[PDB]
Amino acid sequence: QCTVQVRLELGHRAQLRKKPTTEGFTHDWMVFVRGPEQCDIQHFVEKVVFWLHDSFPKPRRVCKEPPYKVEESGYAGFIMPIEVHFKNKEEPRKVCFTYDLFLNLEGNPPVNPLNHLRCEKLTFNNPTTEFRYKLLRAGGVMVMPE
């Protein structure tokens, strides 16, 4: 009957520090989840959970409000599970991403910042009328059902 698609942007910035920290952290980085352009995903996003590498203290980082982001320093890239939880009461209650937080991009001088963007399109089949309105308030659109 109804299919709603909405877009999320997942990304990160990393840059070599001008001097490593006392712990040996060589890079500063920031990972985020956000709407495209003008789109406010807080209409349908309850919270975003970033699962950091267990070298980091309290590695389950939660943002219940924008900005959905984590900013840290470190010495190596790692795989970061990210959960985007929705303001809905039916499945899917969340979407699980596995984000590659890398500190080096070949072709980029390490002194220069790196920026990576991942554009993810979410598809919701037969959402509740409430959730449909939240999705559309966040830039979602209805498309050919299924």
Binding site: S55, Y75, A76, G77, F78, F102, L103, N104
Partner: peptide, 4 residues
Amino acid sequence: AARK
């Protein structure tokens, strides 16, 4: 690259 350095990965963990």
